Every structure is written in C-alpha cells, then in structure tokens.
A paper describes a structure:
In this study, wild-type crystal structure of a BR with optical stability under wide pH range from a square halophilic archaeon, Haloquadratum walsbyi (HwBR), was solved in two crystal forms. In summary, we characterized the overall important structural and photochemical features in HwBR and in comparison with other known BRs. This study demonstrated how the Arg82–Thr201 hydrogen-bonding network cap gives HwBR a stable optical property in a wide pH range.
The values of root mean square deviation (r.m.s.d.) between monomers of the antiparallel dimer and of the trimer are ∼0.36 Å. The trimeric structure showed that lipids (1-monooleoyl-rac-glycerol, MPG) surrounded each monomer to induce the formation of a self-assembled trimeric structure. The presence of glycerol improved the resolution from 4 to 1.85 Å. In the structure, one glycerol molecule was found to be bound with chain B. In both structures of HwBR solved in this study, two guanidinium nitrogen atoms of Arg82 located at the BC loop formed hydrogen bonds with the carboxyl group of the main chain of Thr201 in the FG loop in the extracellular region. The location of the Arg82–Thr201 hydrogen-bonding network might shield the retinal-binding pocket from the outside proton equilibrium and protect the protonation condition of both the interior channel and the retinal-binding pocket.
Residue numbers in the entry:
A (entry chain A), B (entry chain B), C (entry chain C): 11 to 238
C-alpha cells in the first residue's frame, strides 16, 4: 500500500483516529454543562480532521513528488500540514480553556503555532536544499518559543485553579512537551531531511506521534474530574 | 461561454449576487444601531464574495480539468469551494447572531461547516473513484449533523426571544434546511458524481441554489423587524 | 540574485524585517501589563511573518511564471499575498486595539481586508487580460472602502480617548493611508499590470512599502506613551 508500503500506517492511523473520535462522541452524549461540552466539541473535531486527512493520504490525495535542486526526489505527504494547521490550534485552545488562559494568551500561542506549521510546510516544499534546513530551523525555533510559553504563560494561568485542574493541566502539558518536540526530529531523520529512514519508517513515526498527541491527549482530558 | 455553454449561468450568477449586494448596501445607508449594522455588514460581504467568485469562474480562473482513475475527465470549478469556505460560516454567523446563540455554539457549527466544505473539496479533486464517493459521504454526514445542530442548538437559543425574532429565525432556518440539503444531491447528479447531467445543468443548479441561499436569505433577514 | 537581479531587495527586505522583529522583542522584554504585552505580540508577529515570506521569495519558493493571453510572461511572486493575508489583518487589529474599536468594527475591517487581498491575488494570477484589470479594480474599490472606514469608524472609536492615544492613532492612520494607497499603483506600474517598470523596480518599491508599513508602523506604535 502507498509508494513503499507506508499506506499500512495511513490506514491504521485512519482507523485509530476514527475509533478515538467515536469513543469521545459516545462519552459526551449526556453532557449538559456548556463548558464541559465545549471540551467535547473541540476534542471530537481534532481526531475527525485527522481521520479525514489520514484517509485522504491513504487514497493518494495530499501526496506530491518533489524533485530537489539535488536531483533527490522526495515523496511529500503535504496533507499532514493541512491537518496540523487546524488541529494544533485546536489542541492549544483545549489546554488553554483548561488552564483558564485569557483570549489574548491563547491567541498569542495560536499565532506562533500557525507560524510554526507554515514555515514547516515551506521547509518541506522548497527545492533549494539550504532553504529546507533554514526553514526547518525557523520552524523549530518557533516551537521552542511555543513550548516555553505553554509552560510559562498557561502554567501561570492555571496556578490559581483547583488541584484536579492543575494536575490534569500538568499531564496534558507533558504530553505536548514530549510528543510535539519529536516532530522536528522525525522530519530531520525522515526523507524530508537527512533520510536516515525512508518513507515507511517516517510515516510510522508520525502515525504514532499523531495518535498520542490527538487521541491520547483527548482521552486524558475528557476523563478528568477537572472538566466535569 | 465556458467549456460547454455554462458561462451564461456564471454571468447571471455574478449579476444576481452583485444586484443583491447593491440592494443591501442601499438599504443599510441610514443604519445607526450597532447590532443592526453588524447584520448588514455580514450580509453584504456574503454576496460580495460570491459575486467575485462567480466572476473569476466566468473568466476561467478557478477551473481545472481532473482526469479520474476512470479515464473520465471532469471540469472542476474549484473556486466554488473557496467561496463557500467563507460564505457558509458567515451565513451561520448571521443566523446565530439572530438566534442569540453563544460564541461557543456558533463556533461549534462553524467548525463542522468548515469540515463539510473541505471534505467536499477532497471529494471533488481526488482521482480515485471510491475516494470521491467516500469523501462525498463524509461531507454529507457532517451536513446532516450541522443541520441538526442548527435546528436544535440555535432553535433552543432563540426560544426565549420575541415573536418576531422566532418567526424570522424559522424562516431563515427553513431556507437553509431546504437549500443546503440539495447541494450534495447536486454534486451526486452532476459531472463530479454520477454525471446524470452535464456541466451546463450542474452549473445552472448551483447558480439557483447559491442565489436563494445568499440573496434570498439576505433579503428575508434584512427586511425583518427582528433586526430593527 | 533572482530572475532579473531583484534578489537583492528580497534579501534586504528579509534583513530589515528581521532587525525590526529583534528590536521589538528586545524592547518588550520587561513588559508586564497585559494590554501593552498584546501590542508587542501582534507587532513582533507581523515582521516575523514578513521576514519569513521575504526569505522564502529570496530562495525562489513562492515564485511562478504566468503566461497571459497576451503572450506576455509575468514572474509573479505569490508568497507576498500569503504574507499580506495575515499581516494586513494583524495591522488592522493593532490599530483597532489602540483606537478602542469594538470587536464588531475590527472584524468588519478585517473582512473587507481579506476581500481586498484575495481579489488582488486573482488579479495577479489570472491569464485573461481584462480579468487582471477587473480584479485590480475590484480590489482597489474595496481598499478605498477600507481606508474610509479606518478613518471614520476607528476615528470615531478613538475620539473619547486621551490626547496621547488620539495623537498616536492619527500618526498610525496616516502611515496606513499613505503607504497602503500606493500598493495598487505599484501593481499597475509594475510587471503585473502595465509593465512601466520591470520586476527589479517593482520588487524595490514593495520592499520599501512593506518596511514602512510594518517596521515603521511598529516603531511608532511601540514607542508611544499611549500603550504604556
Ligand atoms: C473517516 C473520518 C470520518 C469523520 C466523520 C465525522 C462526522 C462528523 C464530522 C466532523 C466532526 C465534527 C463534530 C461535530 C461537532 C461536535 C459534536 C459534539 O457532539 C458529540 C458530543 O458527545 C456532545 O457533546
Ligand atoms: C478564553 C477564550 C479563548 C478564545 C480563543 C482565542 C483564539 C483561538 C481560536 C482559534 C480558532 C480555532 C479554529 C482553527 C484556527 C483557525 C484556522 C487556522 O489558524 C489561524 C492561523 O492564522 C493560520 O491560518
Ligand atoms: C511565511 C509565514 C506564514 C504565515 C503564518 C501566519 C501566522 C498567523 C498570524 C496570525 C494568527 C493569530 C495572531 C493573533 C495575535 C495574538 C494577539 C494576542 O496576544 C496577547 C498577549 O501578549 C498574550 O501573551
Ligand atoms: C462583479 C463582482 C464584484 C464584487 C463587488 C465588490 C464590492 C466592492 C467592495 C466590497 C468590500 C467587501 C464588502 C464590504 C462592503 C462594506 C460594508 C457595507 O456596509 C456599510 C453600511 O451598512 C451602509 O453603507
Ligand atoms: C487528484 C487531483 C489533485 C490535484 C488537483 C488538480 C489541480 C487542482 C488545482 C487547484 C486546486 C485549487 C485549490 C482551491 C482551494 C480552495 C479552498 C481553500 O482550502 C484550503 C484548506 O483550508 C486546507 O487547509
Ligand atoms: C454513497 C453511499 C451512500 C451513503 C449515504 C450518505 C448519507 C448518510 C447520512 C447519514 C446521516 C446520519 C447522521 C446523524 C447524526 C446526527 C444525530 C444527532 O444526534 C444528537 C446528539 O449526538 C445526541 O444527543
Ligand atoms: C421543550 C423545548 C423543546 C426544544 C426546542 C428546540 C428544537 C428541537 C426540538 C426537538 C428535537 C428535534 C430535533 C430536530 C432535528 C430534525 C431535523 C434535522 O435535520 C436533518 C437534516 O435536515 C438532514 O439533512
Ligand atoms: C460591543 C462589544 C465590544 C467588543 C470589543 C471588545 C473586544 C476587543 C476586540 C477584539 C477584536 C478581535 C477581532 C478578531 C480578530 C481579527 C483578525 C486578526 O487575526 C488575524 C488573522 O490571521 C486574519 O485572518
Ligand atoms: C476564487 C475566489 C476569488 C474571489 C473570492 C472573494 C475573496 C474572499 C474573501 C474572504 C473574506 C471573507 C471572510 C471575512 C470574515 C470576517 C468578517 C466577520 O464579520 C463579522 C463582524 O462582526 C461584522 O460586524
Ligand atoms: C518544529 C517543526 C515541525 C513541528 C511540527 C509539530 C510540532 C507538529 C505537531 C502536530 C500535532 C500535535 C498534530 C495534531 C515540523 C512542521 C514537523 C517540521 C519543521 C519543524
Ligand atoms: C454535503 C456536501 C456538499 C455540501 C455543500 C453545501 C451545503 C454548500 C453550501 C453552499 C452555500 C450555502 C453557499 C453560499 C458539497 C460540498 C456540495 C458536496 C459534498 C457533499
Ligand atoms: C488594492 C490593491 C492591492 C493592495 C494591496 C495592499 C493594500 C497591501 C498592503 C500591504 C501591507 C500593509 C503589507 C505589510 C494589491 C493586492 C497590491 C493589488 C490589487 C489592488
């Protein structure tokens, strides 16, 4: 399946996201409180967008070959970034609403987040080899800023909440810190960067990361006493 | 005009949207009240977007040929999706503001609207025939959910309003329910789907739907006592 | 550097935007007040986006050739419109927050701004010569509306503010009025329109405009007592 077998991870990733989406829908069917319900909506939308993106990539939509100024040909699943552009701000909105961050503070992170994803998409699409790395570098710096602000700004915001809320915040923060930081490493080691692994390995890595960052995070959030 | 004469419905769509836009601007010239003014702004912007999109299609911009795995070649007016991505959230915002729905509830419907339009663009553009129908199904599913939440959520929001506001909401709701539901049928019967009608018929049908969903909706909204 | 030497202005643009971004970051390091902080975040994000767009153009990403019905071939840097789509709304948010405009008034200007940039992108990309000038005219009309509303609506909002705030507002308003108005003239004289100057000249003109409109504007804003 796919260019070199990687479609198996695309199909698994689809099924995982859909399953996580369905569990979330079934869990929130009787929810009445408007704020609790907002966490449901956001958290159901996240794996919906990712299931759809995964499925599109399984069918070949969202996949282009890029010939670098190298002559190197790279099979670029650009549908990922489409997914990330919407799902990463939604994840930040989720944890920001948990933390009790202001509209101003969530907007700030979201802006930096969008910058991170778009400068990533440039890195991935550009044919000029130094540009690929220059943009990966720009995007990674912006992630570092984002991750610092998440800990500093949202961590302040949550400091006055109850123990359950601070505890769930810390768990969700740590899922973000560990998993999001791997993404630039995965890009670097995969076929977009140094090609230490091929498309099959790279696809498997992002499948696992996306599943943790979306369904794993969602699980932890929606089961917390904090949101109830 | 166009690939097979369909440019005539593109010119008429352009002129219809423009005339609606002009009517609404001339009708709003003396408006002082901020809330009333916001309905004018939203409701002018909608046919402005659609006139600009129709005109772009009339000139051939936003038209691509797509060769399906079928061998079938489909003439895809993709600029319709660009238009819809922004006008369908704006329509929902308009009806939401009338209903007195919360920021949470409006945002929720916009989310799922975006999901419907984007998955509909994938359906239209993918070459894999099973994928085209798969995405059309996904999108239709999301449409049903949206229409349900419109009736239930926005309908509950409007239930404490005055009689004029309730009656206008029901009129506008019923315009959306009938008109919006026809769009997936139009895709299925038109050249992107089963090709029971060709490009000229399909273009005629979207022109009529669009004029009703935007200018007809706008007319009913802006002439109501509810917004005054 | 570039197709016809214009790389020099792409590089210089990158550097000036980056330096403006670093001066603003340095300047806001001790800032504690939330509303003052917000002005820093928006004003640092603007030249960040613009520096990245310039660097992308310097490396040739965001450059297509368009063959017009004319036989004319035009080297179109489309990465500019990506940049503008985000930076012009942010510029409007920055001045609306200074003016104390409502969320409804800011959103209204952003909507017509988006319309202006997107119709300009169509003008730039369309192969049909009459459509180029039709969209340029659409876009310019929308710009005039936007500039009038900026004067009238934000001007009214700021009229109850302190004298420092009114004075800064008038400064920033006058930068937008003068500099923004030049953009459509620059499009018309340059390679996209009448070709009175070539790509090199056009790229120089946009570089100066962008620098004034972003770093010059930010400088005036961030140094004002009005935000302190
Ligand atoms: C192959 C991928 C297929 C994706 C198909 C998903 C169909 C629906 C489409 C998009 C998801 C958007 C969710 C609807 C808004 C949140 C409902 C909130 O409702 C639910 C809670 O239990 C109630 O709080
Ligand atoms: C306490 C109240 C908090 C209210 C929330 C503050 C703002 C966060 C809202 C984000 C909207 C989420 C939808 C997806 C992002 C928009 C498209 C993509 O994202 C955007 C970028 O500009 C890139 O396009
Ligand atoms: C080539 C680059 C690609 C383009 C990438 C687009 C970037 C997205 C641009 C704008 C999105 C939202 C930013 C909103 C500013 C937040 C102010 C609120 O801030 C406030 C307080 O300081 C919080 O700490
Ligand atoms: C053939 C396709 C042509 C497309 C025509 C585009 C129209 C020109 C400008 C459009 C700006 C975008 C819509 C906003 C109009 C201003 C609000 C108006 O609100 C205002 C008071 O309510 C009354 O003036
Ligand atoms: C199998 C065929 C594949 C290639 C298709 C043939 C060429 C297609 C040509 C142009 C595509 C037009 C894209 C229009 C985007 C409008 C909504 C903008 O939406 C965008 C979303 O927000 C993504 O985040
Ligand atoms: C091409 C093959 C043919 C495929 C057929 C496509 C159309 C199938 C449409 C199915 C729509 C069912 C969705 C109902 C969800 C809304 C219930 C609303 O429920 C509500 C809360 O969740 C409960 O509190
Ligand atoms: C005591 C207060 C009563 C509550 C008043 C709020 C209005 C809702 C009332 C009862 C639930 C009825 C669900 C209506 C959805 C049916 C159309 C769903 O449509 C469906 C699509 O059209 C298929 O495409
Ligand atoms: C009568 C009630 C008074 C309400 C006033 C209080 C709230 C203050 C105003 C906040 C404005 C927020 C406007 C929305 C963001 C603008 C797009 C800027 O984002 C940027 C995007 O990247 C462009 O698409
Ligand atoms: C191929 C397509 C070419 C032509 C398409 C036309 C250009 C697309 C324009 C997009 C901008 C529309 C979104 C603005 C929403 C924000 C106003 C939100 O309004 C609301 C305020 O509260 C009003 O007071
Ligand atoms: C910094 C960086 C990246 C980070 C991406 C991130 C952090 C993605 C997160 C995705 C999630 C959470 C999806 C749901 C890229 C674009 C891969 C490559 C360039 C450098
Ligand atoms: C469900 C569905 C669709 C629905 C489109 C709708 C409902 C469009 C509304 C347009 C309006 C109201 C424009 C103004 C598509 C994308 C046609 C085809 C895929 C399935
Ligand atoms: C009216 C008009 C234009 C206006 C562009 C503007 C007003 C750009 C502002 C840029 C800034 C402020 C960047 C930072 C275009 C799209 C060139 C060409 C179509 C006519």
């Amino acid at each position: 399946l796919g260019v070199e077998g990687e479609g198996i991870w695309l199909a698994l990733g689809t099924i995982g996201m859909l399953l996580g989406m369905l569990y979330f829908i079934a869990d929130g069917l009787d929810v009445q409180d408007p704020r609790q319900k907002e966490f449901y909506v956001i958290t159901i939308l996240i794996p919906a967008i990712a299931a759809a993106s995964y499925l599109s990539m399984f069918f070949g939509f969202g996949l282009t070959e890029v010939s670098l100024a190298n002559g190197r040909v790279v099979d670029v699943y650009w549908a990922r970034y489409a997914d990330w552009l919407f799902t990463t701000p939604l994840l930040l909105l989720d944890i920001g609403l948990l933390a009790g961050a202001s509209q101003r503070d969530i907007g700030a992170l979201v802006g930096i987040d969008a910058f991170m994803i778009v400068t990533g998409l440039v890195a991935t699409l550009t044919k000029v080899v130094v540009a690929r790395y220059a943009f990966w570098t720009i995007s990674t710096i912006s992630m570092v800023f984002l991750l610092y602000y998440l800990v500093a700004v949202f961590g302040e915001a949550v400091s006055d909440a109850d123990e359950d809320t601070r505890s769930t915040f810390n768990a969700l923060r740590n899922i973000i810190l560990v998993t999001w930081a791997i993404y630039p490493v995965a890009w670097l080691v995969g076929t977009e960067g140094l090609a230490l692994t091929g498309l099959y390995g790279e696809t498997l890595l992002f499948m696992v990361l996306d599943l943790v960052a979306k369904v794993g995070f969602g699980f932890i959030l929606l089961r917390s006493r904090a949101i109830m």
